[PDB]
Amino acid sequence: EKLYSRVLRFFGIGESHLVTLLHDLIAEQTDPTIAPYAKTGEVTIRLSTKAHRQKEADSKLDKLEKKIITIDNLADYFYGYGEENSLPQVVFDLLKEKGKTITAAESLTAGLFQARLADFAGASDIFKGGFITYSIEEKARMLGIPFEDLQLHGVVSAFTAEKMAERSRQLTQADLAISLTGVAGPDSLEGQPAGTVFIGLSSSKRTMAIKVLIGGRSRSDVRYIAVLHAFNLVRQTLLSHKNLV
């Protein structure tokens, strides 16, 4: 008999919060065993059971996974399976599955989002290119956003996130466009504290932006975690059944 495992991957809930929900079934567990593991920007849960064949183990792993997912809104945070899966891999597969293309305009991440897209073979089917608008002048110049408007609202704002996404979509005619603008830290920017990030998303149907706070993190961690927030926003939009793309 071999040890079979299954890894559940979650984004949007901290490892300290998720296990408080779970401890009912962690303090009660038997077989499969449950083991949570946190990493930069996300958390996972390892289920482990003994069985003779992958079919038998899958059947027991499925029952405990159903218990976990239905708790609270964990279905909103669970995004995939696998020791190596990641939000960018899930989004890449989802983009190819739905025949959509994506572009981006990045400031503080400065290319990390689009570089993660190119990590996967065949990315050219879903990604044709994008923009790194690191200055206010290049946000205006590259994308065609009025310079005064950027100055008035600030580059760290929902307005600027929405405009970067809408204009980069219109310049590339990709199906979706992501924008990332915020404060890498540690200094505040425009009165916005370190870790404040606005992430825009634009399709032909709608343009919107989310505001996230990645507080208490290094420069590199804010940029890295902001990329995951952007990929998760794409994931939710593609999985939504609401004609969003």
Binding site for a copy of itself (CB under 8 A): 106, 108-115, 117-119, 121, 123-124, 127-135, 137-139, 141-142, 171-172, 184, 219-220, 223
Instruction: Report the distance separating Cα 199 and Cα 233, nearest Å.
Output: 8
Our finding on whether 129 is near Cl ion (CB under 5 A) is: no
- Residue from 3, 59, 75, 82 that binds Cl ion (CB under 5 A)? 82
- 27/121 with CB nearer a copy of itself: 121
- 49/109 with CB nearer a copy of itself: 109
Shortest distance, position 29 Cβ to a copy of itself, whole Å: 38
- 15/26 with CB nearer Cl ion: 15
- Residue from 61, 94, 108, 225 that binds Cl ion (CB under 5 A)? 108
Enter the tokens of residue 92: 């890449």
Shortest distance, position 76 Cβ to a copy of itself, whole Å: 29
Shortest distance, position 149 Cβ to Cl ion, whole Å: 16
Shortest distance, position 243 Cβ to Cl ion, whole Å: 30
Secondary structure letter of residue 127 according to DSSP:
B
- 14/99 with CB nearer Cl ion: 14
Our finding on whether 181 is near Cl ion (CB under 5 A) is: yes
Instruction: Report the distance separating Cα 57 and Cα 41, nearest Å.
Output: 29
Our finding on whether 68 is near Cl ion (CB under 5 A) is: no
Shortest distance, position 121 Cβ to Cl ion, whole Å: 14
**CB under 5 to 8 A by kind: which of Cl ion, a copy of itself, none does 14 bind?**
Cl ion
Taking Cα atoms as reference points, which of 70, 65, 117, 74 lies closest to residue 96? 117
- 4/113 with CB nearer a copy of itself: 113
Do residues 207 and 163 touch, judged by C-beta distance below 8 A?
A: no
Instruction: Report the distance separating Cα 7 and Cα 154, nearest Å.
Output: 41
Instruction: Report the distance separating Cα 35 and Cα 225, nearest Å.
Output: 23
Our finding on whether 110 is near Cl ion (CB under 5 A) is: no
Enter the tokens of residue 135: 């200055």
Enter the tokens of residue 225: 């975690």
Do residues 155 and 143 touch, judged by C-beta distance below 8 A?
A: no
How many residues bind Cl ion, per CB under 5 A? 10
Residue with tokens 């149907």: 205
**CB under 5 to 8 A by kind: which of Cl ion, a copy of itself, none does 17 bind?**
Cl ion
Instruction: Report the distance separating Cα 91 and Cα 26, nearest Å.
Output: 30
Angle at 109 between CA 198 and CA 154, to 5 degrees: 40
